[PDB]
């Protein structure tokens, strides 16, 4: 398969590009102050999977606020590590989700966020 640092989302493996782009473009035209986000565990992560992986988040929510919400859903221990990756790098927690989206969304108009217990995506 691919190299360990190539970001793979089961969402993309389960839904053809056409379906994703139709959905992402429609949701952005409808809700211009919200951004659509797919959240999944990185393949090698020793972290629980998320119940819900598809989010519509306010554009003025910060990355650190979204992280709080996602971490709350995973039900981690107080000592546990968790890192987000967008396009292979840890996104700045002080950025807004709207800015992160504007810079990083794919051609299907989704923003893709992976999480791991390791600070490097493929480790």
């Amino acid at each position: 398969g691919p190299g360990s640092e190539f970001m793979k989302f089961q969402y993309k493996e389960d839904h053809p590009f056409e379906y994703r782009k139709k959905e992402g473009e429609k949701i952005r035209k409808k809700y211009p102050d919200r951004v659509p986000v797919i959240v999944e565990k990185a393949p090698k992560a020793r972290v629980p999977d998320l119940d819900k992986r598809k989010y519509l988040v306010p554009s003025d929510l910060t990355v650190g606020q979204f992280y709080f919400l996602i971490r709350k859903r995973i039900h981690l221990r107080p000592e546990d590590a968790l890192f987000f990756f967008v396009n292979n790098t840890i996104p700045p927690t002080s950025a807004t989700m709207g800015q992160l989206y504007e810079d990083n969304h794919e051609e299907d108009y989704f923003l893709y966020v992976a999480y791991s217990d390791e600070s490097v995506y493929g480790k």
Binding site: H15, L56, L61, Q65, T93, S94
Partner: peptide
């Protein structure tokens, strides 16, 4: 339940803004 959207509630957003406020 194929592929629903999840949106946070307003109170959930409020709690997040309080626990991860800007510096």
């Amino acid at each position: 339940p194929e592929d629903d959207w999840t949106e946070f509630s307003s109170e959930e957003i409020r709690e997040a803004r309080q626990a991860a406020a800007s510096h």
